[PDB]
Structures are given as structure tokens and as C-alpha cells.
Design a protein around this nucleic acid. Structure first.
Lengths: 63, 97, 216, 202, 25, 100, 91, 128
RNA sequence: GGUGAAAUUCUUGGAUUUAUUGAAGACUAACUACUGCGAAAGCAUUUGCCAAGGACGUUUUCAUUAAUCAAGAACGAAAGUUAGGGGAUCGAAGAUGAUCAGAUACCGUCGUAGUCUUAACCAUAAACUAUGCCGACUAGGGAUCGGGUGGUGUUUUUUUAAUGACCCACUCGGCACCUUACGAGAAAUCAAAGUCUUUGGGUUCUGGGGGGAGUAUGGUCGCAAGGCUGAAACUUAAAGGAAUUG
């Protein structure tokens, strides 16, 4: 399956209207030079890995 | 009364200036008026430039930019949060930040 | 329910010998059949290329050229000039505020019947000691600049043909020509012969073309 | 007589004999005595000269254009009318032109046509004001004027006919599958009424 | 209301009364 | 870059030696005197050709005015119309060494 | 002297036929009885006979044109379009 | 430089994204697809997920025929319209890159008028 | 395609998208703007012809000719009307999909007149600088357009020259502008609405509670729509400026 693992790089801010959503950058965890910024659901810090169904959508702000 | 001396924008000696059209709403709006900006951008997004140059032949040749002027309606300008009302004294600052 | 590309061919472009890169492209057509020769259509195609991609350089990564197909031979097809241009990116990069603009244009036939409209653009600038912020002009200056531009463009185009001008404008001789001609009045940054437009062609003349070509 | 569009009496040297072959070209809005008219494939594209259609470019106009090569002139023949060229396709040499009704017609490039538009101009903007000028007009053409109305004629004389009131009774639009004696009114009317607008073909 | 439409309404009324008056020539 | 033929014509009037109208022009051009003819635009090609022939026989110069005979008469300073003018002593102008 | 505020020539039609039509006629009647200017002799001796052809009564040359006026505006556009194409061709 | 080359016209309105891949000329198109071809949602017709998902199969086809390298021209609606593209443009572009098709000579050819005909809206404009 | 979301609509006749060629009519982008010109309305592609005009250089040209103005006359956006040509887009009317309690309205699609021009008419707009014209003075301030004064300057290169524009300042008619306010005006504001109760610089129009009513009435101009002029009866105790709290 084309599923990805990616470890956090840094926190970016809490977005969306109700602020449940947060922004996070991750490192691809096998291509360290390749990073990606995305949106998440819940409590997050650095140094945690995320299982990604896409590595391309390259999310951005949200309300 | 006169909320603004110019009433408007830089006519002051002209009588008539041809109009333009708000790129958002298409309203007619004189060029003296009609907020004017410039949308300078690289086409590429920073998130993509890595894959871009990796796939790019002509290695490190250049990267062009997008150059676009943008007239605006007043109402649109305000609803864009692009321009906004200002304190009375603050209304004469003819500079950006 | 066909897979057309399992009917199609591949034709190698071969451009003039006045350039450098001639392995310019490959393009496909449906196979020539009865009552239908793919060449009949391929004779009319037109292609667009960066002059950088042509001459190997990247210093011409902004101008560009149109090439019209003229002939075919043995899975390979010969082109010829069809027009020049100037890219929008560079155009608006050049075109900023606080510098008056000028544009002129003329139309003339070569020594040969290859009639061309040719445009010229110019901006004003300041000279190294200036403080005011707009740097504009007067209409006398503008009119005389337009005049000289037209005269020079005509003088260069008449005594020449397409190949002459192609070999001029790859090295770009003519903007420096205008610069040397115009250093009297005004610096005039961003002088550029930016666009030419074919208006007419003579009889096709396979021979001139295959004389131009025919190497490697 | 019976025409706008004045006539032009051209004389040509007969190629194959010492004589002249005087002709009747329609005047084409600029013509005048002492003038020369050129005819040919190799003729100048000025006004009055007559040329094939492959021999002239797109956008050009012409009058008196033939519908077939050698019918000595058919179309764009009345006053103020003209036909516009809009294309060539040398696959079968077919020119494509636009006709005063607003019609697209595809014909032979070797078809001929005289360059310009026909005189007379706005003959039809001025009102006649009255019966007498209509009378003289239709005198010089044909006995179609005056014109009585079926709603005043008798049922024996018209299908509209009938009595106790000037009226018809049934539709005034008459299916083209119909036949003689029934064909009084509108024929194949794809609609009817007051209309808009304002092009004919597209 | 609005002055432009008072004006339009009065113009309508002028037309109407003038028609009613020229009824009697 | 250019001087107006109209002013030059006024000059040739006020100073130079000359005459008007086809007949006098041909008289002068037959006596071989006139140095410059001016001819309008509207005039018959036949008369234009006749005058051109007389000029080429007299070794005389020609100008083809860029306008009609009414305007030529206007410019030579009248209120009727003239097709042609003849000049025997091109006067205080220098038309002879112009493009003419 | 003046003899008529407006109708002029339309007085031949008296009280008849409607004012709209008489005005629409007045226009064209002036146009056609107008002694126009000749492109050839330059004079003003050009008058209609036999609607569609106008004669210069001195140079004798006839010219074809509109019925009531010499040039139709569409005919002038035609001449322009034609010379444009003539140049683009010959050149 | 054993890459064989094509060109890619990308056209991003605020409603849809058009990918279009052809030879170095316009004719003999190679691939063409939209966001609507991948979703029948009607508002996501310009979704950049859709543009990505379209560029995927476009590059697939360009390879299956045998193209390797691309030049790219791009445009908005233009004329007398926005002049600005939607978000899907850039995502389809990056998806092309990620597909592996090598790239060069990026350029914008969106149409621009010298003050051409009137615009829609009627002096007072499409108010939401 | 189009939307906030959809729908109407177009699509094996292969739409949209792609390339080429063409035609038409309109519009003159960006560059390029407290900048331009102009009695006002107003005016952007180029060139040529036509006249015209302000401002200036100005030891030139004449001698009080002149300033505002009833009557009277010219010009006069757009829309609008009459008629020819034109008719691409845009688009009242109109026809249609949605929404909505309803929507003959906003949104969407098409579309007539018109939008363009020609020949006539009209003659008004927040036709607003809602602020006349000419002169004297009040601080500066710096920009800046057009015009007029110097640099043992800059660069343009040739051997410097030369013009040349730029700058440095010197300088005038400018569109105008910033802080202050001395004066004025509650106040907003006014390089001028300043020059005034210490009341008068030449000077023309309109203005006098609100409405009724820009109606009626007539007259007059107009193809008409309508305009200019223009009341009264009757009715009635009011509407705005700034700023404060909400």
C-alpha cells in the first residue's frame, strides 16, 4: 500500500473556526530533506509520527 | 458633510476620467478612485519548488513570475479585508506599513 | 475503443541551419492511408520554441520563436521561420511604473517578398544623479524617438531577408544598433525589438529551404 | 424599367474577330463613363472589374456573383445588395460566401463576380405616399397591384372568403404538403408573429 | 419615499391629466 | 524636415514670374520659358499626359499637387479653380533645388 | 420670402399623407435635387436623372450611386475595404 | 538528452482545471482531463485534489505513449474576466512534477486585452 | 459552462479545450500616475493636413480699448426620440432556472431597443470644487507640470569636443498639497469660506419656515418624452451640523 510515515518538524498554529484543527509540518521520515505542511485534528507536539494517506495535497489554511 | 476633502481620489483639475471595472464585481469605478494593487508572485509554491527543480531540465535556469494589476470596487475592497476603515485622524496616512 | 496512438507515427523536426539546436522536437500524426496522407496536414503545423532552447544558451530564456512546417522527408520534417515574440513574464518585469513608455511599429517587405510588421518598445530612465521619482518625458522626445525607430527598423529590414535577420537577432545586433544610434538623446532602458509578424509569403520555393538546410 | 440598379453597357473587343460584343453589366456603385472594366483571373481587384472568387481574398465583397461557372451572373444582382466572401477550401475549389438574406452558400471558386455593390441604394426607404406611384411602379413590372383581400372576397373566390364579418375562420398558415388553391396565407411558417432578432443564419 | 420616484409619479400624473383635459380639446 | 508647398507657392506667386490656366501654360511651355508646371490631381489624365510631354520636350519640371483645382486656385490666391500653373522665373523660393 | 417654417418642398403634398412621411420624404427630396460636386471637374453640376445615375452637366460624365444621394455610406465602406485588401494583396 | 518533449497547456478558471498535453505544437493532443473527470461534485470541479488526481493520469498517458519531458504554458480565463487562476492549477503542476515528467520553460500566456469589449455585470455588478 | 449550492443551457452532428487562417464591429489596457491638456460638458493607439490656444523669454507692437451682466446667442454627459448605415460584446423591456412565505428583484442563461456612426432634435445630472471673476497681503515647507538663469559638475567618447538630459541650486504661470493658525466659522472646516459689527475692493444670480408643488394656470420651445417660466388655496410645529454613551 502507498501509505507514508512522517514525523513532526514543528507546530505552526491553530486554525479553523472552532479551533479544533491545528497546522503541523512533518518530515517524511525516509526523505528528511522532503517536508510537508498539513492540517491535523487533535493534540500534537513535535517528535510524533503520522500515518499519511496522501503526501501531495499540501494543505493550507482553513476556516 | 464632507467626510473627505478629495471626496474621492486624485481628480482635482480634470472634470472626467474614464472608468474601469472591479475585477471582482465588475462595477464601474473611476480610475482616480478604484484601489490599484499589483499581484506579483512566483508561479511555483514553496512547497512544490523542491519537486519542481528535481524534475526540471535546464538546471537552475530561472524561475519567472506573474505580473498582474488589480483594480477594485470599494465595497469589494472592504469585504476583502484588503482595505478597511480607519480612525479619523489616521485617515491621512498615505503610506502602507 | 481504438488506442489511436497505435496508428500514429513520429516525425523529427529539423530547423534552419542558422540556429544551433535542430533536434528540436518529435511530433506524431495518424498514419497516412488511402485518400489521406498525414503529410498533407503535417505541412501546415506550427511550433513554438524558446530561443534559449534553440541556441543552447539561457540568456534568451525570454524571447521565443514560431516555426511553420514546410516540408517532410523520411520520417523527418523541415521547418522555417514563422514569427518572433516577447514573453509576458519578462515584458511586465520590464514594465514598471515611474518610467514613461514608447512603442512604435512599422511594416515593410524584404528584398524578397516576405512582408513583416515589426514592433519596437522603449522605456525612459534616469542618469545616476537624479532625485525625482517619475522620470517622464515630453511628446517632442516621444515623437522623435518613434521617428528614428521607424527609420532604423526600415533601413535594417529592407536590405535583408529572414535569414539575415534571424542571424542578426540571435546575437541581437539591432538593439545595440539602436543604442549606439540613440545615446545622444536619452539612455532609454529596456529597448527591445519585441515582436515581428509575417503578413505574407511568396511562392513556397522548396529550393531555397533545402539549400538552407541539408547538413548532418 | 422595372429595376433599381442601373445597367452598364460595356463594350469589349471580340478576341476572335474584328468586332465588339456589347454587354449589359449592372452598374456597381462607382462606375462612370470613359471607365475601363477588367475581367479575368489576372484582373486588378478594383471596383467594376470582374473576377473569380479564388482570385480575390476573404472578407472581400462582390455583386452579380454566379452560382455556377458561366451562368453569366445570378446573385447579388438587385440594388444595394452584395455578397461577402468568408472562406476558400481548394478541396474541390469551393468558395464560401454570405448572401444578402444572410445565407451561407458554397460554390465554385471559378465562379465569377463583379466587384462592389449595386447602385440604387436606399430606393426602399422613401415612402410611396400613395397609390399612384405604386401604380406606375407595378405598371412598369407586372400586374400584381392592386391587391384585394380574401376576407373581403367571396368563399367562392378565396378560402378566407366568408361572411357576416370580414374574417377567416381557420389558420392562416398552410402546410406545405398542401396544394394549389389552398395556398393562400402563410405556407411553412416555422413560427408566426412579431419577431426578434436579428440574424438569419448561424 | 424618494424624490426621483415622486418625480416619475408626477410625470405620469401630468400625462394622465393632460389626456383627460384634451378629451375636451 | 519639410517646408510646405503651399507657402512655397505663395512665395512663387508674390515673387516669381508665372501664369495660370492650361492655354497660357502651354504657350509658355512652347516658348520653352516656364521652368515649373504645377498640375492638380483631379484633372484629366489626358491633359496631364499632354503637359508631361510638353515638359519632357522642354526639359521642364512638374509638380503633382496633392489636391484639386479649387484648392490649387485657393492656394495661388484666388476664388476660382485652376488645374495648372506655369513658372518661368521661380521667384524668392528655392523650389528648383528642392525635391522638386 | 421664407414662406414656410419647415415643410419646404413637401408643400407640394399639402395637408396630406402624414407628417412623419412628409419629413422622411423631405430629407431624400433635398438630397436628390441637390446639385452635388463632381469628382472629375470638381464643379457643382452633378444632378440626378433616372434614379441611380447622376450626370455632370458640363463634363458629361455619369456616375452610378444611390438613388437619392450619390454615395451610400456602405459604398464608401466598400471602397475602403477594397483598397485595404488591394494593398494587402499587391504588396 | 534522450527525452522526447511535449507541451502542456494548463487552464484554471475558478470553476475547473484543464490539463492539456500535446506535442510541441497544439495538434495531436496526448492527454486532456479536468477535475470534473475525476469527481462529479460540481463545486470541487476546481479542487486541487482534483487537479492532482487528473495530472496523475495525464502523466501516466504521456508515458504510456512515450513522452518524457514537458514545457508548460498556463492561463486563467482571461479576456475580460478574473485574469487570476484557481488553486487547482498549481496542484496539477506539482502533480506533474511528482509524476516524474521532466519539466522546463515555464510560461504564462493568459490572454490580455488592449482595453477590449465591455464586461459583464452592468455598471453595478454581480453582488453576493 | 455557471454558482454561495444547483438548475436552466451546449455536447458522437465530438462540445469545452487545443492549433491555424479569417471577418466584423467596438474599445485603446499594462506601462501609466495628488501628472498631463483643456470655458464647461470633457479628452489615451500612430502619422499627416487643418486651423486654434494658454503660459513664457521678451529694453518689441497700440493707448483706457476693460470687469460682471437682464434681453438676447453658442457649446452642452448619458438616457431618449426621427430616419439611413452598423449591429462583436454589454444589455432596461422581455424570456427563462434557482431561492424565498411569496420575487414579474437581487444570482444565473439568452436577448430586442440602445450601446457605434451619419443628418436632425432635445437641453437636462450629485451638469459638485454642491465654493464666480481680477488684484494686495499672511509661514513656511518642500515636491511636481509648462516657460526663463549659472555649473573651471556627472555621465554619454574620440583626443577631449558637441549637444544632450539628469542633478545643484536661481527662477515664473500651475493642477495642487502638508503642519499650524494668526483671522474667520458652533462645528465639521477654511494657504483659503482668511482680509468683518472696527460692519462698504469693482461686480452678476438665486435664496427666505416646512409642505402643498416645481403641482395648477396660462405663455413659450419641442416630433414627442418634456423643459424654461411659474403660482394660490389648504395645512403644520418643524428638518439638518458636529460631537458624546450606548
Amino acid at each position: 500500500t502507498p501509505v507514508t510515515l512522517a514525523k513532526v518538524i514543528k507546530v505552526l498554529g491553530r486554525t479553523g473556526s472552532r479551533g479544533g484543527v491545528t497546522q503541523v509540518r512533518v518530515e517524511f521520515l525516509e526523505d528528511t530533506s522532503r517536508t510537508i505542511v498539513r492540517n491535523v485534528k487533535g493534540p500534537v507536539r513535535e517528535n510524533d509520527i503520522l500515518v499519511l494517506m496522501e503526501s501531495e495535497r499540501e494543505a493550507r489554511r482553513l476556516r | 458633510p464632507k467626510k473627505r476633502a478629495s471626496n474621492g481620489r486624485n481628480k482635482k483639475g480634470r472634470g472626467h476620467v474614464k472608468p474601469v471595472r472591479c475585477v471582482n464585481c465588475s462595477k464601474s469605478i473611476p480610475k482616480d478612485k478604484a484601489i490599484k494593487r499589483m499581484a506579483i508572485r512566483n508561479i511555483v509554491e514553496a512547497a512544490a519548488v523542491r519537486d519542481l527543480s528535481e524534475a526540471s531540465v535546464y538546471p537552475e535556469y530561472a524561475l519567472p513570475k506573474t505580473y498582474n494589476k488589480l483594480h477594485y470596487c470599494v465595497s469589494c475592497a472592504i469585504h476583502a479585508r484588503i482595505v478597511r476603515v480607519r480612525s479619523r485622524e489616521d485617515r491621512k496616512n498615505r503610506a502602507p506599513p | 475503443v481504438v488506442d489511436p496512438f497505435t496508428r500514429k507515427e513520429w516525425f523529427d523536426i529539423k530547423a534552419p541551419s542558422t540556429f544551433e539546436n535542430r533536434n528540436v522536437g518529435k511530433t506524431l500524426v495518424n498514419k497516412s492511408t488511402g485518400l489521406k496522407s498525414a503529410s498533407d496536414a503535417l505541412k501546415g503545423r506550427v511550433v513554438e520554441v524558446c530561443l534559449a532552447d534553440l541556441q543552447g544558451s539561457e540568456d534568451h530564456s525570454f524571447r521565443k520563436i514560431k516555426l511553420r512546417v514546410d516540408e517532410v522527408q523520411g520520417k523527418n520534417l523541415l521547418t522555417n521561420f514563422h514569427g518572433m515574440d516577447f514573453t509576458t513574464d519578462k515584458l511586465r518585469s520590464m514594465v514598471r511604473k515611474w518610467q514613461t513608455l514608447i512603442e512604435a511599429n512599422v511594416t515593410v517587405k524584404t528584398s524578397d517578398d516576405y512582408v513583416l510588421r515589426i514592433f519596437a518598445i522603449a522605456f525612459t530612465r534616469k542618469q545616476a544623479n537624479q532625485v525625482k521619482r517619475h522620470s517622464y518625458a515630453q511628446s517632442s522626445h516621444i515623437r522623435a524617438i518613434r521617428k528614428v525607430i521607424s527609420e532604423i527598423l526600415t533601413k535594417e529590414v529592407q536590405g535583408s531577408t529572414l535569414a539575415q535577420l534571424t542571424s542578426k537577432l540571435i546575437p541581437e545586433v539591432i538593439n545595440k544598433e539602436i543604442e549606439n544610434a540613440t545615446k545622444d538623446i536619452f539612455p532609454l532602458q529596456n529597448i527591445h525589438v519585441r515582436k515581428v509578424k509575417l503578413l505574407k509569403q511568396p511562392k513556397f520555393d522548396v529550393g531555397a529551404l533545402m539549400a538552407l538546410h541539408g547538413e548532418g | 424599367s422595372g429595376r433599381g440598379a442601373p445597367l452598364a453597357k460595356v463594350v469589349f473587343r471580340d478576341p476572335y474577330k474584328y468586332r465588339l460584343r456589347e454587354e449589359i453589366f449592372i452598374a456597381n456603385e462607382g462606375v462612370h463613363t470613359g471607365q475601363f472594366i477588367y475581367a479575368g483571373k489576372k484582373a486588378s481587384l478594383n471596383v467594376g472589374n470582374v473576377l473569380p472568387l479564388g482570385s480575390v481574398p476573404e472578407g472581400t465583397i462582390v455583386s452579380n456573383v454566379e452560382e455556377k461557372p458561366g451562368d453569366r451572373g445570378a446573385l447579388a444582382r438587385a440594388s444595394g445588395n452584395y455578397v461577402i466572401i468568408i472562406g476558400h477550401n481548394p478541396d474541390e475549389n469551393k468558395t464560401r460566401v454570405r448572401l444578402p438574406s444572410g445565407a451561407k452558400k458554397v460554390i465554385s471558386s471559378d465562379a465569377r463576380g463583379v466587384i462592389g455593390v449595386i447602385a440604387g441604394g436606399g430606393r426602399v426607404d422613401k415612402p410611396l405616399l400613395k397609390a399612384g406611384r405604386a401604380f406606375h411602379k407595378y405598371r412598369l413590372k407586372r400586374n400584381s397591384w392592386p391587391k384585394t383581400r380574401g376576407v373581403a372576397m367571396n368563399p367562392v373566390d378565396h378560402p378566407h372568403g366568408g361572411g357576416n364579418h370580414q374574417h377567416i375562420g381557420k389558420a392562416s398558415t398552410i402546410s406545405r404538403g398542401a396544394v394549389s388553391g389552398q395556398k393562400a396565407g402563410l405556407i411553412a411558417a416555422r413560427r408566426t408573429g412579431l419577431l426578434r432578432g436579428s440574424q438569419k443564419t448561424q | 419615499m424618494r424624490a426621483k420616484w415622486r418625480k416619475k409619479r408626477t410625470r405620469r400624473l401630468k400625462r394622465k391629466r393632460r389626456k383627460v383635459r384634451a378629451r375636451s380639446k | 524636415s519639410q517646408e510646405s508647398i503651399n507657402q512655397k507657392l505663395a512665395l512663387v506667386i508674390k515673387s516669381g514670374k508665372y501664369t495660370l490656366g492650361y492655354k497660357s501654360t502651354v504657350k509658355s511651355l512652347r516658348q520653352g520659358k516656364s521652368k515649373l508646371i504645377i498640375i492638380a490631381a483631379n484633372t484629366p489624365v489626358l491633359r496631364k499626359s499632354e503637359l508631361e510631354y510638353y515638359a519632357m520636350l522642354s526639359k521642364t519640371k512638374v509638380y503633382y499637387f496633392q489636391g484639386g483645382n479649387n484648392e490649387l486656385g485657393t492656394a495661388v490666391g484666388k476664388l476660382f479653380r485652376v488645374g495648372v500653373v506655369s513658372i518661368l522665373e521661380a521667384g524668392d523660393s528655392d523650389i528648383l533645388t528642392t525635391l522638386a | 420670402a421664407k414662406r414656410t417654417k419647415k415643410v419646404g418642398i413637401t408643400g407640394k403634398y399639402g395637408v396630406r399623407y402624414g407628417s412623419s412621411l412628409r419629413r422622411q420624404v423631405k430629407k431624400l427630396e433635398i438630397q436628390q435635387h441637390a446639385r452635388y460636386d463632381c469628382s472629375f471637374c470638381g464643379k457643382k453640376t452633378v444632378k440626378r436623372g433616372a434614379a441611380g445615375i447622376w450626370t455632370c452637366s458640363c463634363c458629361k460624365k455619369t456616375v452610378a450611386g444611390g438613388a437619392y444621394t450619390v454615395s451610400t455610406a456602405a459604398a464608401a465602406t466598400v471602397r475602403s475595404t477594397i483598397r485595404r485588401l488591394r494593398e494587402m494583396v499587391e504588396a | 538528452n534522450s527525452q522526447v518533449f511535449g507541451v502542456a497547456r494548463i487552464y484554471a478558471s475558478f470553476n475547473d482545471t484543464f490539463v492539456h498535453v500535446t506535442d510541441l505544437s497544439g495538434k495531436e493532443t496526448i492527454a486532456r482531463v479536468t477535475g470534473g473527470m475525476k469527481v462529479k461534485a460540481d463545486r470541487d470541479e476546481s479542487s486541487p485534489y482534483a487537479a492532482m488526481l487528473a495530472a496523475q493520469d495525464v502523466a501516466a498517458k504521456c508515458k504510456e505513449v512515450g513522452i518524457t519531458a514537458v514545457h508548460v504554458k498556463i492561463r486563467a480565463t482571461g479576456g475580460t474576466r478574473t485574469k487570476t487562476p484557481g488553486p487547482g492549477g498549481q496542484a496539477a503542476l506539482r502533480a506533474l512534477a511528482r509524476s516524474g515528467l521532466r519539466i522546463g520553460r515555464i510560461e504564462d500566456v493568459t490572454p490580455v486585452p488592449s482595453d477590449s469589449t465591455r464586461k459583464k455585470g452592468g455598471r453595478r455588478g454581480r453582488r453576493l
